[PDB]
Structures are given as C-alpha cells and as structure tokens.
Write a protein that binds this ligand. Structure first.
Ligand SMILES: *[C@@H]1O[C@H](CO)[C@@H](O[C@@H]2O[C@H](CO)[C@@H](O[C@@H]3O[C@H](CO[C@H]4O[C@H](CO)[C@@H](O)[C@H](O)[C@@H]4O)[C@@H](O)[C@H](O[C@H]4O[C@H](CO)[C@@H](O)[C@H](O)[C@@H]4O)[C@@H]3O)[C@H](O)[C@H]2NC(C)=O)[C@H](O)[C@H]1NC(C)=O
Ligand SMILES: CC(C)C[C@H](NC(=O)[C@H](Cc1cc(-c2ccccc2)cc(-c2ccccc2)c1)CP(=O)(O)[C@@H](N)CCc1ccccc1)C(N)=O
Ligand SMILES: CC(C)C[C@H](NC(=O)[C@H](Cc1cc(-c2ccccc2)cc(-c2ccccc2)c1)CP(=O)(O)[C@@H](N)CCc1ccccc1)C(N)=O
Ligand SMILES: *[C@@H]1O[C@H](CO)[C@@H](O[C@@H]2O[C@H](CO)[C@@H](O[C@@H]3O[C@H](CO)[C@@H](O)[C@H](O)[C@@H]3O)[C@H](O)[C@H]2NC(C)=O)[C@H](O)[C@H]1NC(C)=O
Ligand SMILES: *[C@@H]1O[C@H](CO)[C@@H](O[C@@H]2O[C@H](CO)[C@@H](O)[C@H](O)[C@H]2NC(C)=O)[C@H](O)[C@H]1NC(C)=O
Ligand SMILES: *[C@@H]1O[C@H](CO)[C@@H](O[C@@H]2O[C@H](CO)[C@@H](O)[C@H](O)[C@H]2NC(C)=O)[C@H](O)[C@H]1NC(C)=O
Ligand SMILES: *[C@@H]1O[C@H](CO)[C@@H](O)[C@H](O)[C@H]1NC(C)=O
Lengths: 872, 916
C-alpha cells in the first residue's frame, strides 16, 4: 500500500510517475482569465470536459504555483454528479508538478464529466507562464503588459491542465480587461460585452484541437498594421505604438511566406487571422502560438535607418520558421518531447526553402551550409545525442531543444530531399500533414508516410535518428572505390586507447553520392566496407557534392593533393567550401596534418567560400590571442591584411550593393579595424565623432554601425555617450549593436558595470543578460572576469533562470567553451562537480568538458606545425 | 533715441531699453493664451494675444520672455485704424540678459488706445521643475507616467509665454488647452466647454479669470483622479492625485473644506472662484504653490495615510493647506506692489496658519507650537547678516532671496505681537478693511499699516458713530486718532530696522529701570565691534509684564531707549513679555533670574505655561549673548523633572540634545558621554512611561516620538532592543506587519544599522506608495554608519532615478548633521559645485540648504577657514548670496560659544554626577 509519495497535506498521493495517467482524457477547456495589470495578479476559472474511459477514483493533471480555491465535478451523463455536482478533495504533489482530484464515488467509463476549478496567482516575474512585461515609450513612460509563454511545460503555471502534447483539446477563452487595453488570443475575438464596473469582457472563438503549450493570451496597449493573404487570412503585426513604423517589412514578408506555405503544403492556414506581436521583454527568439506568434523585437521589427542586411536576413528567417510551425507543430505535433525534432528539425528546414523561394535577393541557399557545420562540432564529440531520445523531467525536455534537434534535424532532412528528389519529397510531406492533421505523430510515423511517396528508407533513417554522431567516409588505386565507413570523432585518434568506441554498432546507411565530371553518381553504402568501379580514371574524384550529405569525406590516398589551386572553378562553389570545411575537421580528427590545412585562393569570388575559410582563420588568431602569446598571433595578423589587402580596400563604407555584397562589407571591415589597421579604424573615428558631435543628426550607413560604435568605445567619453544614448533609442536592433559596442572595451570595471545593470534588469533588460556575458567572455581582457563572476553569483543567476533555460545554457558554455588549457579543464571539472552538489545535472556539462579537452589535444599535437608559417 | 551705444540684442541690433524693470507706458489688460503641449514629444506650441492699453506714445513694447522661440508677431487695433485688422508685422528683438524682448513698431502708437499684440512661440517642456516643465510618477503596477506642470513664482512665467512678468501688471487670463483623450487639463478657473477636433484631439476652454498677477497663472496636463466636495459657500473643492493614491486625499478634502469656510467667515470676503483644486504633484520643487483655483503641493504636503503618516505628518499637512488657502486672500486677492514687500504675502499667510488651524483644529494644539516660529527666526535675526523685513531687490536670484525666515517667520511674529496689542476684534477688522480696499490690485508696506492703524471696533459704527457717517467730537475720538498714529510709527520701525531688541530690566525696590539695545549673539557687551552695531537702533516696543503678587497683565509702550515704571507693592519678581507674545528678549539684571528660577524650582505652576518656554529660550540665548553664565541656564533644567507642559519640557530638552550633538561632532566624548548619562537618568521617569504605539493626544504622540528618538539616539539599550524586535518582525512578515506611525522612524533607523535592514529598507523605498513612509525610510537610510552607504544615497540623488532630485538637498542635509557623514557631505559639495549648479539655480532654496546644511553646524576655527575660502572661490566666479555671510557669522558664534562655555558645561555635568 504505502509505497507512494507524501502530499503537502501529509496524505499519500495516489500516483507515482511523472507521465500523466491515460484513463481521463480532456476534450474541451472553457477558460476565463481576469488579470489585473496594476495589481499584477490574476483570477481565473476553468471547466474541463474530460471523458473517462476506465474506472478511476481520482483525476490527475498538472498545476504549478497556482492557488486552487474551488473544484467541482459535474456530469451530464452519470448523474450521481449532476448539477450542482460534488465538491472534490484536492491533493498537491509538487515534485511531479501534479495535483490529484479525489472523487468521493468512482467515475464510470465512457461517460463525460465536467471538472471546474477556480484558481489565482500573481503574474510571473520570470518571463514564463502568464507573466508581466514592461516597455518604454518615446516620452519615457513605461507601460505594462501580460503575456503567455508555455513551451514546453509552463502552461501548467497558468491554469491546471493535462499538460502533455498528446492531450489535444478545443479551448474557448474569455478575458476581462480595462478599457485602455486590448486582449488578443489564438483565435479572433467574437464579441465584447461591457460590464457593471466599466470593465470589458472579450469572448474568443473556440480553437481546433491543439496542445496546451500553444494556448496564448495577451493583455496590452498596442497598435497594428494589417493585410490580407490570398487564401482568406488577416495578418496583423502588433507592436508598441511608437514603433508601428518598424512593422512594415514583417507584414510584407509574412504575406509572401504564408502565401508560399499554403500552396507549397497544399493546406490552407485554417484560422481567419494570424497575428504577429513584438513582446519587448521576451526570453525566446519567438514562439509559434497558433494565430498569435510572439517575437522578440529584434526578431520582427525592421527600421531601415538602423538595421543590417544581416538583420533583415535574421527577421525574415524567424518569420519563416514560425509560420512553418503552424503546420509542423500546431497542425501536426510530436506525440511526446522525444521526437521534438519533428517540429523543430522541419521548421528550421522549411525556413531555408521558404526564404529561398520568396526572397532570392537575400541569397539564403549559400548560407545554409553553416547550420550543419555548427551541429557537426557538437555531433562529433561523444557528449552528443541521437536526434530522438527519451525525456522525462522538465529541464531534461528543455535540453531536447538544441542544435541536434534543429540543425541536424534540418540537415538529415536536407539529405533525403536530395535523394528522393523534391517532387517525391513534397508529395510525401503533404501526405504526412494531411494524414496527421490535428493529431500526433511519432518519429516512425513521419518516415512510414514519407516512404510511401521503399521500405528500405525506414531503416536507412533509423541509422540517422536513433544513433548518435556523424559517419566518416574512408575511400581508398585507379578505379579504387574501396569504401569503408567509421564514426567520425575528434580528440580521439586511431592511436589512442580511447578510440575503441569508434566501433560499437556505429553503422550508417550513408547515401553516398559523387562526381569525376559534371554529372553525379548515386549509390547507397549500407556496410562497413563496400565498393564500386570507376568508369575511367580522372584527375580528382569528389564524393560530398555541396555537402548535401551528413558525412565527412576522407580520401585515404593521393586525392586531396590536387586541390586545383590554379583553376578553382573546375570544382563548384559549394563543394569549394565543403572541401575547405572538411580539411580542418580532418586535421583535428587525427588523420591529416596542418601543413595542408592552409592549402587554400586570393581569386575566389564566391564569398561563401571566401568567408568560410577566412572565418576559419579568425578562430586561429582568436584562440591564440586569448592566451596572450603574440609569437603566433602577429604572423597571423598582418599576413591576413597584406594578402587580403586588395579586397579590403575595395569595400565602400556605405550600405550599398546586394545582400551578400553588403554582408561581405561588414564582415570584412570587422577584421579591418578589429586589427587596428589604421586606414579604416581611422575612418570610423571621423564618422563616429561626426555622429557623436552631430548628436543623432548625422546618419551612419547600416552595414558599418556595429563597427563604428565598437571602434569608438575605447574613449570613455564615447563609451559613456553610447551607454547614455542606448537608453534613448527606439530601435532594439540599434541598441543591440550598441550593447555589443560596450562589450568591446578592455576596462575591467567598465565591463562589470554593464554586467551589474544586467543583473538589475532595468536599463539593460534581463533578456539580454546571457548574451551580454557571452560577448564579454569572448574578449581575452574580460574572459576571466566573466568566469569569476558566474561562479560568484551562481545562485542568483539561478534565481533568475530555470537552469534548463537557454540563458543558463548560453552563460556556462559562453564563459567556458573557448578554453584550451589543462589548467581551466580541471577548474571547470570542478564547479561542475560543485553544482552536482545540488541536484543540477545538464548534458552541457559534458559537452563543454569534452570541448575544452578537444581544444587541448588540438594544441597538444597540432600547433608546432603552424608556427611554421612565418613569411617575412 | 540719440546714442547708439545701448545694449546689443542677439542679432546685432542695439536693443531699445536697458533697465531690468519694465516700462509702465504699456499696460496689459487681458491675455488670450492658447497652449498645445505634447507629452510624448516633450515640447509645446503656443499662441497669445495681449490686449494692452498705451499710456505715453512709444515706438516699441517691452515684454519678458526667456527661452521661448518666437516665430511671428503681429499688432492690431480697433480703436486705432492704422493697425486695423489684420494689423501689422512686428520686428522682434531678444535681449536674453534682462530676460526682455522688444517688439518694434513701424508707426509710433497713440495714447489712450487699446491694441492687441499677438505672438506665436514654442519651446521644449522644461527640465528644471520651473516654467512649464515635465514631471513623472510611478504607479502601483510599476508604470511610469508623465505630466506637464507650471510653476511660476517668482519670475518664471516668462519661460512659458511672453508677458509683462511683474506682480503689479495684473490682467484677466483666458486659457485654452489642447490634449489627447487619455489626459485631463486643469487651469486656474473651471472648464467651460470641451470641443472635439478632427483627429480625435480635444480642446478645453476655461472661464476667463479675474484680474491676477502673472506668477499665479497655472495649467496642468495629466491623468490624475479626484475626490470632491462642496463648502458652505458653494465652492467645489477637489483633491487631485495620481490614480493609485485617491485613498490618501480624504483628510486633505476634510481640512480644506473646513479651513476655506473659516477663511470666508473670518475675512468676510468670499473666495471668488467657482472651484478650488488642490493637486499633489510628484516631482515638485517648492512644497506648495498657491496658484489661484489650482494649488500645487508636494505629496508630503497634501496626502495623508493613517497606516504610515505620523501625527507630526498630520500637523504638517494641516499647516500647509491652511497656508496655501490664506494666500488666496493674502497674495492673490491682494498682491504686493513689488517683491521688496513680499512679506505682505508670506508673513500674513504664515500668521494665518495659526489662526485658522487653531480655530478649526484645536486638537492639533498648534497654538502651543507657534512660539517655535519666532525662536527659529531669532537665531538669524540676532546676527549682523540679517536683513529688514522689507529690503530692495532687483535681480531674479535677488528676488528669491527675499523668501526667507524674515519674510515668513518674523512677519508672522510681529503681526502676532501687534494683534495682542490691539485685541482680536480690532485686528480682524483692520485685516478686513485692508483686504476689501485692495481687492484685485496691489499694496505696499505703508498701505498695510495705514489700514491696520485706522481700524474700527464695530461699536464705532453705533448710533453715536465714532468712525463713519457722522461722528461726535469726543475726547476718546481725540485719543483714537492719536493712538492710530502711534501704532503706525511703531509698525513702520519694526519693518525697516533689522534685528531684534533686547530689553534689560533691573528691579530696584519697586522702581524698574528699562533699557533697550540690539540683541547680538556672538559679540559680547565688552567687544570692540559692539557700539558700532548699536548704531541708531531703537524700537517702539509694546511691553507686557506680570508680577509675583498680581496676575494682571500690565502694558506700556517704550519708545525711549531708557525709561522706568513703578509698581504698586514690590513683589518677589516680575516677568516681562507675558506669554512671549513680544518680538524681544528680556534680561533680568541683579537678582531677577534667581528669583524666577527659584520660583520654577519650588512651585513652577504660578508662571504661565508660555512664560516658562519663553524663560527657557531667553536664558540659553542670553548665554550666547555673554550676559549670563552657562551655569544658571543648566541650573534651570532641574525643574524639568516636574514640568508637565510638553512645550516647556521639549524646549529645555532640545538645548541639551543639541549640546550632545555639538560634542559628538567634535568627538568630545567625555562630555558627550556625560550628557548621555544625565539625560537618561534625570528624565528616566517620563521616558519609560511612553508607550510604543500611538494612543494619546497629538502632544502625547509628538512627545512620545520625541523622547523615544532621544533615548534611542543615546543608545539606551532598553529602547533600542524594543525597536530592533519591532523592525525584525516587520522584515520577517514581508514588510506586511504594521509598526505604529509615531515610532515608525525610530524603528527604521535601528534596522538600518545592519547591512540587511539597510538593504531591505532601500528596496522598500522604491516600492512604497506613501511618500511620508518614503521620507521616513530615506531618513533612516541616512543614519547609516558606513561611509559607502551614505555616498551611495547621495549619488543616487544626483542621478535622480530611485531618489528623486527634489529630495537631494534634504538628503545631503540629513547626512551632514550626523558625525560619520559630516565630512563626506562637505567634500561632495566642494568637489561637485559646478555639477550641483546645473540642476539648481544659484538662488534656489535647494542651493541654500545644501550650503547651510553642510556648513552651518561647523564649530572650529579650521573649518571656518575652509568655508571662507570656498565661499570666496564661489564669489570669484560671480556667485553672490546673502547665505554666505549668514553661515560665516553662525560658524564664528558657534566657535565663540565653545570657547566661553565648553569648560563650564564639562564642569557642570561632573558636579551633577557627584550630587546624584
Ligand atoms: C484592477 O484593479 C484596479 C485597482 O484595484 C481597478 O481600478 C479601480 O477600479 C475601481 C472599481 O471600478 C475604481 O473605483 C471606482 O471609481 C469610480 C470613479 O470614482 C470617481 O468618480 C465618482 C463619480 O464622479 C466619484 O464619486 C468618486 O469620488 C471619484 O471622483 C467610482 O464611481 C466607483 O464607485 C462605485 O463603487 C462604489 C463601491 O462602494 C459604490 O459605492 C459607488 O456608488 C459606485 O457604484 C469606484 O469607487 C477605481 O477608481 C479604480 N482604480 C484606479 C486606480 O483606476 C481596476 O478596475 C482593475 N482592473 C481589472 C481589469 O480588474
Ligand atoms: C532553441 C531554444 C534555445 C529555445 C528558444 N528557441 C527560439 O527562440 C527559437 C528561435 C531561436 C532558436 C535558436 C537556436 C536554435 C537551435 C539551437 C540553439 C538555438 C536561437 C535563437 C536566438 C538567437 C539570438 C537571440 C535570441 C534567440 C532563436 C524559436 P522556436 O523554435 O520556433 C519556438 N517555437 C521554441 C520555444 C521554446 C522551447 C523551449 C524553451 C524555450 C522556448 C530560445 N530560448 O532560443
Ligand atoms: C521658501 C521658498 C524657497 C519656496 C518654497 N516655499 C514653500 O513651499 C512654502 C511652504 C514652505 C516654506 C518653507 C520655508 C519657510 C520659511 C523659510 C524657509 C523655508 C519650507 C518649506 C518646505 C518644507 C519641507 C520641504 C520642502 C519645503 C515649505 C509655500 P508658499 O509660501 O505659500 C509659496 N509662496 C512659495 C513659492 C515659491 C517662492 C519662491 C521660490 C520658490 C517657490 C520652498 N521651496 O520651500
Ligand atoms: C476681469 O476680472 C475682473 C475681476 O477683477 C472682472 O470684474 C468683474 O466684472 C463683472 C462683470 O462686468 C462684475 O459683475 C457685475 O457687477 C455689476 C455691478 O456694477 C452687476 O450689476 C452685474 O450684473 C455684475 O454682477 C464685477 O463686479 C467685477 N468685479 C470687479 C472686482 O471689478 C472683469 O469682468 C474681468 N474682465 C473680463 C473681460 O473678463
Ligand atoms: C481500462 O483500463 C484498464 C486498466 O488500465 C485497461 O486494461 C489495461 O489495458 C492495457 C491496454 O494495453 C493492457 O496492456 C493491460 O493489460 C490492462 N491493465 C493494465 C493495468 O494496464 C483497459 O484496456 C482499459 N480500457 C477499457 C476498459 O476500455
Ligand atoms: C474542436 O476542434 C475540431 C478540430 O479543429 C473541430 O472539428 C471541426 O468542426 C467543424 C465544424 O463542426 C467541421 O466542419 C470539421 O469537419 C471539424 N474538423 C475535424 C477535423 O473534425 C470541432 O468542431 C471543435 N469543437 C468545438 C466545440 O469547437
Ligand atoms: C597577457 O598579456 C597582457 C599584456 O598586457 C596582460 O595584460 C594579460 O593580463 C596577460 N594575460 C594573462 C592570462 O596572463
């Protein structure tokens, strides 16, 4: 009997596992909220029409930090619980964030009973649940709004509910409010009824079946700009009144993208309205609430006096990602958080399609390669995880929202789009959605639908979704296709006794694909060793075409050395950087050395190739200047300026030209005075002080703003003028760049004053705190200050953030993942074991542990080689 | 004119007038003023049409204008057809050093004809809490809201609209405002009608005012809420506050109805407007401002909340409200001709606080506190740096310097003296005739005395008329006119002679030799500068005196520098200045003082309660005068063991409390420690009778706080442990349990001695919704002992975000008076003088107390040196203030007091510990 947990009233709680029981099933939530924005609290009532199916003496559902005052169980059918119904005993067990409704009788199956509850709480101050946010206006008034953010386990802090994504229901919502506020929610507002006190109550149309984590409601004081999509949907971009000017690109871009998705998926967006609102203190980048999409202001609003081409590119990506979610996640959602990549993998992949086919000017296809690359860094260590993987606690579910779920989800999806061909792919995607509309899909179900566009493909992708890591292609004599696959790793060489893990079951059904002329050959590799015959022999032979496959190519002999250092356009531009990328991880990996590492092309015109390789050189400089040895840094510095002096001088300090043109300019001039190369750092200072002496009158071109501001930080008369003007500005894009601009100063106290105002949270919003730290810790001057500060104020940072939070995740790897010493590796082994003193376990612990360990062993056996490039 | 070499206007261009006063050839009659502020762009746009009457023909009009962009300016007339509609364009000349503009006339204007001058002007909303400025407050939710407020006195109306900014240029004002949906607009007079406009903006029209000086014009744009009620005469009194504070305006409404009703019966003149608005502005520099029909207050001056406001707080709010309402007659109905006679306003409003509060709220017992008003001004009036009540003044900072202890306190005190001389009903009818005979115009000093002199006692309107219609030539009717004239010469001298007279009386058998001299602290009677300052001083002093044998008040005027009276039968003593109603000190020569102290020591109750507080005040002063040894003043404090009149008790107590702080600043710890022990022993009985909750009278409550603060400032372990518990419980209950208001300040101080309590108090400061509680918390934070915490408060006030700048000077003042922060405040001011000047004008009250509050407590020759050198530094840069001299004289007389009396104080204490 008494094998169960104690409740808060000392009674034993009738359920013992974190997943909810399956016997009670909700169908309909009627939901009343009455928030008060001066009292900063709310009162709320709720009726859940839950259909029983098995005998049960107790209903179980979730609730957190809510005071439940009344709880009644009516029934229309089994009329023992007929009107007024009976009053229910309510037990609470917080360690599973669950409550037990103890019925006095026993519920009997196939009947519908109606659970009503009254509940109340204060508006959150943690930027989760139903919480309070502030914003500044043009005159410096601050006004208050009440927002919801629920993904993934936080809706249970706003109303008691069955808070698992499989428990889809309908949700009618009513909200009481003052006359000076508007109320928005998922659906459009049906009617407004004026009441006794001068208050209004807004009723909203019932929703389609959906998960709890998409329910939304806001109370605020915003204006909007509206337009209509071809389909029959009204799109409104809401924001603070003094920023309605900044909403123009978003309504344009939203109209196109939703037009695209409706035809591309061949499913109409099923709501009458879709609204996009720029929440000023917002923790996520944005959030795919059905019909009411919340954005960070820097993610939605675009001011052409203040915003990069890169910032226009960021806004349009996030407004593709979040519209895509309306199908991947809202229409179809994973049955449980283990297959979270079904929403996020597909959303991040759909963004690449949408922007490419809607905004070609922005040139997003050539950029996409980076996202796999970032996940490959993670995926190449043993700390990584399979794309689908069990997940039970809250903070463990929040761990599933990583670059494995987004980037690698998006890239292995990209692989299969190459193999089956976009035609068969798009038909499969449409069959997948239409089948699973308003329901829940498991990891298997997507492929079992995608395959029938071929029972072969299902176990092919089994190798990719259920197994950790990234395969390695070993090719080995004329027509020599002696294929052998491995598990690519890093910091573990064939020499080492650690390397036996390269052999466990690690067998990928890699869909290899090649060319030795302008034609691609396609063939599967389902075994450790298999092979082919070359038709005739050729100069070079390259497999990974455009790196569209999630594997790195290693030619076992005499193939690398050709690379065409004279005519490079023999090999296509994507394969150009594909080869560049592969010829550094192979260096770290253990097979190749660094002498061929710097092999690469001062006459490369595709900037993707140019920036990718040069960004690779940036890392070498920074990693060495961070340990303060100029013996290898100075050679890297003016090497890059002399050799890349033509290109650098060509650029014209203004925001003119095309998008990769404009991005190449700021990227190039970044280094240009991140190096104290006078010709241009001197340039900034006269523009800088022309503007600083103009006092907001001079206009600086877009693509140089972050550079100019950054340059003029060092003079305290500037740094103090930048901080002061930060407060004044009405562009979150502009003030982000200022905030970077103040992280550049090398004054240890000026740096920490920035951090002190973040902790306070009023002048610099708390949403920016982690990024502010992360910027500082990247400079060598502030690198140790940040590391010190986090360890000194840990318990306070943890009171701000949820610890499965992204801010906590970005603060620790932002402060530690750039280390390369054995000194710091033990010191970070401590304080990770110091925080498992408390119940604080995060996989990012090992990912960063192993990441500094791989930084040691890449200096341990690779730097001697690179001192050897002194020129003169 | 002939000579080109005139002042040079700002565009080249010789400027055609060069006095700072305005010319009186053009007379304004009626201003048509349209204002359109915008509270999200923080600027305003305005238009104005002044109906002027020309007296002598000119080629130019001279106006005041400061910091206002004028865009165009026409002239029209309909009596002079040359400027017939649409009139002519005028050249505008700015001379921004006189704050004057000149409008240049194309054809010289004609006498006796009315013209209309029209200008468009614009400016940003002020930032210095003067002119038409921007203010902000915080709501319960944490929102920040903006409002736009005017404050003009004394010469800032010219920063909001061009005008003839001098008090004698009264006019009617017609005011239209334009605003958004979410704001109300208030002005002096009621809103006649609200027209809607295309775009959804509304325009308010207000009824046109009665004649009025410019400095009283007012207008406000905000979103405040109001509670309302009506007086007996049918005035609509409304209390406005930020919306989450409507609660705290109930007591204000209750008192303003009562006080208004009192004023209308007492003056026998109705308040002439239909409504009176009282509004609690959050970021407000002055404290209160008596604009006709729309009176602005500091929240602490107007709002009351019983859970956090003390009884002292309640008394303060009643005083201020009473004070502002008095101004609607004294100052608005009757305005001084020019700022030299500003005491005609502030002296009478100050005095009327006493009459009104005493008449409507006797529970407050404000009559027993009124003596302190006169003591505070005798401090400064007994120095050479003092000034007469009415002195000339010309420049803006020169004008504002006239609002001091002399204009207010001395003015009130000599009025009170005069009232006792003539009797309440004679005095009332003098006032009534004055206010009725100068209604809607101005008056000067001589005008007041002539009306108060010629007052008629209501039986002078009888059948056998003595004042009016047909008098009989009687022998009292020859004494009436002779007595009236005597009263006028006497009052004249009290307003033109600086200083305060010292009447020294030696009792000789049953003769009594009277002498008068100027009273002077610091300087002894045996000083080389002492006959040089007894120059020419001579007062007509209506004296008063009782005896040991007869309690009948005797009254004789001394106009003669020496004179003598004879009594009926030589009694055991005489006591001059009965109830201390006279603006003079009385020194008893020979045996006079011991006879009076001996009386207090056996049966102290035969001396009238005010006689006692007067006697305590009189000898501690005479110690400073060199005429008495500190011996017998301290010997008078024995007898406070029996004293039951808290006024006398508290006077005596505070002299000893200040000696302690004087020692503690100087680190003279053996006396300071002894002073701690004498106070705690000799007043142990009455200290432990005091409750720790606010349960008795207002005096009982005020005495409770007084004594408990003292016992807790002397680290009396029993009282400090009580307060530490109370604080600990309050902190442990999430700042949610209730502390009694009379001991609230003491508890927050004891809590602020730990870094925990200090930090907790500082975060509660930002969150509190009672500005009385915030005041108390800020004091408590300022009692910290760590120099780091004190500096943080100061710099918090410099930035003005969590601590609003309106409190910065009181903050510095608080820090400076306690030993561990005395030095820090001094260094801050000298190292940030240029920085303090950007926020506050040189003549502002804020600058006055920052200076006096950090320096006037110094008592060593070393510190006098630094102060002179700093003051010299300041005046070398062109900053002169009268406060510089006043501080220097105050410092030196402190130094002298230590040198003549610190030995005797140490000696006395030790003698007392040997006896008890
Ligand atoms: C969130 O919470 C805030 C604060 O709790 C609420 O704001 C308050 O709401 C209350 C209730 O509506 C408001 O109080 C009301 O004010 C009205 C206006 O008062 C002025 O005008 C009247 C008429 O001229 C004058 O009599 C009065 O003195 C003021 O000049 C009153 O009319 C209301 O009175 C009603 O209720 C009382 C109850 O005793 C009855 O006796 C009356 O006859 C009448 O029926 C009432 O007092 C208050 O003003 C609000 N505060 C603020 C700061 O605005 C929000 O409503 C709430 N929001 C939500 C969404 O819940
Ligand atoms: C992904 C995590 C961290 C949760 C949350 N993701 C979002 O913001 C995305 C958009 C986004 C993604 C990323 C990103 C992707 C992959 C791997 C690392 C990071 C960075 C940013 C970013 C960059 C700069 C500045 C600010 C943000 C933005 C909206 P989304 O995926 O469409 C919504 N539906 C998911 C909701 C959610 C789930 C669980 C916890 C919190 C929120 C968040 N904190 O970054
Ligand atoms: C005194 C000057 C500078 C203006 C202003 N006086 C007022 O607030 C009075 C009431 C008042 C008076 C005093 C006071 C009296 C005597 C000698 C020194 C000071 C102190 C306070 C006080 C108490 C606590 C906190 C803050 C202030 C209040 C309203 P009032 O007299 O009816 C209106 N006539 C004055 C308008 C004005 C005139 C000239 C310059 C500025 C404003 C002010 N700053 O103290
Ligand atoms: C400017 O303000 C003055 C106040 O200083 C206003 O004076 C007042 O004007 C009204 C109307 O003209 C007078 O009321 C009238 O009095 C006569 C008695 O002769 C009566 O028969 C009328 O029916 C009415 O009651 C009032 O007495 C007068 N007060 C004073 C003190 O002069 C003046 O009207 C204002 N001017 C403008 C243009 O608004
Ligand atoms: C009602 O619930 C009972 C008990 O949970 C169900 O019986 C279970 O059914 C599952 C379904 O797969 C079986 O695996 C188990 O053997 C049964 N018992 C338990 C303890 O799980 C029953 O099927 C449910 N549905 C009805 C009665 O319609
Ligand atoms: C709950 O949501 C479901 C799914 O969105 C609603 O079902 C649709 O109902 C409409 C109107 O009755 C029909 O035209 C569709 O055929 C239904 N779609 C599906 C997939 O069944 C349902 O009506 C909603 N319930 C409530 C009470 O609003
Ligand atoms: C590296 O050298 C610089 C030279 O200024 C020094 O200031 C810095 O502290 C050094 N870094 C470390 C980690 O010792």
């Amino acid at each position: 009997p008494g094998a169960f947990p104690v409740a808060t009233n000392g009674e034993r709680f009738p359920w013992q596992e974190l997943r909810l029981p399956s016997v009670v099933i909700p169908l309909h939530y009627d939901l009343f909220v009455h928030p008060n924005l001066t009292s900063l609290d709310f009162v709320a009532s709720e009726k859940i029409e839950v259909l029983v199916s098995n005998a049960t003496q107790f209903i179980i559902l979730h609730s957190k930090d809510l005071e439940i005052t009344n709880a009644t169980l009516q029934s229309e059918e089994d009329s023992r619980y007929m009107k007024p119904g009976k009053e229910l005993k309510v037990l609470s067990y917080p360690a599973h964030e669950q409550i037990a409704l103890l019925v006095p009788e026993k519920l009997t199956p196939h009947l519908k009973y109606y659970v009503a509850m009254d509940f109340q709480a204060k508006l959150g101050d943690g930027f989760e649940g139903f919480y309070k946010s502030t914003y500044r206006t043009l005159g410096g008034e601050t006004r208050i709004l009440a927002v919801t953010d629920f993904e993934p386990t936080q809706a249970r802090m706003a109303f008691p509910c069955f808070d698992e994504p499989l428990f889809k229901a309908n949700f009618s919502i009513k909200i009481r409010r003052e006359s000076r506020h508007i109320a928005l929610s998922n659906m459009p507002k049906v009617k407004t009824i004026e009441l006794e006190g001068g208050l209004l109550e807004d009723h909203f149309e019932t929703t389609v079946k959906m998960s709890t984590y998409l329910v939304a409601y806001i109370v605020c004081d915003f204006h909007s700009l509206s337009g209509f999509t071809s389909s029959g949907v009204k799109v409104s971009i809401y924001a603070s009144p003094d920023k309605r000017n900044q909403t123009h690109y978003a309504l344009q871009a939203s109209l196109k993208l939703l037009d695209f998705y409706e035809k591309y998926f061949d499913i109409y967006y099923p709501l009458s309205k879709l609204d996009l609102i720029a929440i000023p203190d917002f923790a996520p980048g944005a959030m795919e609430n059905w019909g009411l999409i919340t954005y960070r202001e820097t993610s939605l609003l675009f001011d052409p006096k203040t915003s990069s081409a890169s910032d226009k590119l960021w806004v349009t990506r996030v407004i593709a990602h979040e519209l895509a979610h309306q199908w991947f996640g809202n229409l179809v959602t994973m049955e449980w958080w283990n297959d979270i990549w079904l929403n996020e993998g597909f959303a991040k992949y759909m963004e690449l399609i949408a922007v490419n086919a809607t905004y070609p000017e922005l040139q997003f296809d050539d950029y996409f390669l980076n996202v796999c690359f970032e996940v490959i860094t993670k995926d190449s260590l043993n700390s990584s995880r399979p794309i689908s993987k069990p997940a039970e606690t809250p903070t463990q579910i929040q761990e599933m929202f990583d670059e494995v779920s987004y980037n690698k989800g998006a890239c292995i999806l990209n692989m299969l789009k190459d193999f089956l061909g976009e035609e068969k792919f798009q038909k499969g995607i449409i069959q997948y959605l239409k089948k699973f509309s308003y329901r829940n899909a498991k990891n298997d179900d997507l492929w079992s639908s995608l395959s029938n566009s071929n029972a072969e493909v299902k176990e092919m992708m089994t190798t990719w979704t259920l197994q950790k890591g990234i395969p390695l292609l070993v090719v080995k004599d004329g027509c020599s296709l002696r294929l052998q696959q491995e598990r690519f790793l890093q910091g573990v060489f064939q020499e080492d006794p650690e390397w036996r893990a390269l052999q466990e079951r690690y067998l990928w059904h890699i869909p290899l694909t090649y060319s030795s002329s302008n034609v691609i050959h396609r063939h599967i590799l389902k075994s450790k060793t298999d092979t082919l015959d070359l038709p005739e022999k050729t100069s070079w032979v390259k497999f990974n075409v455009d790196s569209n496959g999630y594997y790195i190519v290693h030619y076992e002999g005499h193939g690398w050395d050709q690379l065409l250092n004279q005519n490079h356009t023999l090999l296509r531009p994507k394969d150009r950087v594909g080869l560049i990328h592969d010829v550094f991880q192979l260096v770290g990996a253990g097979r190749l050395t660094l002498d061929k590492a710097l092999d690469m092309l001062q006459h490369e015109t595709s900037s993707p190739a140019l920036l990718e390789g040069l960004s690779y050189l940036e890392s070498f400089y920074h990693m060495m200047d961070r340990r303060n040895i100029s013996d290898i840094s100075e050679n890297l510095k003016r090497y890059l300026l002399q050799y890349f002096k033509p290109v650098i001088d060509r650029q014209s300090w203004s925001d003119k030209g095309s998008v990769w043109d404009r991005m190449l300019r700021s990227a190039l001039l970044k280094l240009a005075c991140d190096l104290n190369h006078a010709p241009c750092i001197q340039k900034a200072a006269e523009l800088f002080s022309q503007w600083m002496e103009s006092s907001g009158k001079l206009n600086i071109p877009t693509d140089v703003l972050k550079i100019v501001y950054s340059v003029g930080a060092q003079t305290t008369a500037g740094w103090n003028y930048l901080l002061e003007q930060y407060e004044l500005s009405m562009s979150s894009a502009e003030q982000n760049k200022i905030l970077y601009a103040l992280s550049t100063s090398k004054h240890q106290e000026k740096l920490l004053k920035l951090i002190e105002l973040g902790m306070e949270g009023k002048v610099i919003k708390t949403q920016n705190l982690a990024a502010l730290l992360h910027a500082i810790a990247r400079r060598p001057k502030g690198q140790q200050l940040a590391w010190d500060f986090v360890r000194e104020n840990w318990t306070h940072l943890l009171k701000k953030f949820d610890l499965g939070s992204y801010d906590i995740r970005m603060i620790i790897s932002g402060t530690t993942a750039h280390f390369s010493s054995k000194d710091k590796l033990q010191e970070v082994k401590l304080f990770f074991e110091s925080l498992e003193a408390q119940g604080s376990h995060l996989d990012i612990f090992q990912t960063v542990l192993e990441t500094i360990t791989k930084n040691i062993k890449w200096l341990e056996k690779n730097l001697p080689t690179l001192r050897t490039w002194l020129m003169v």
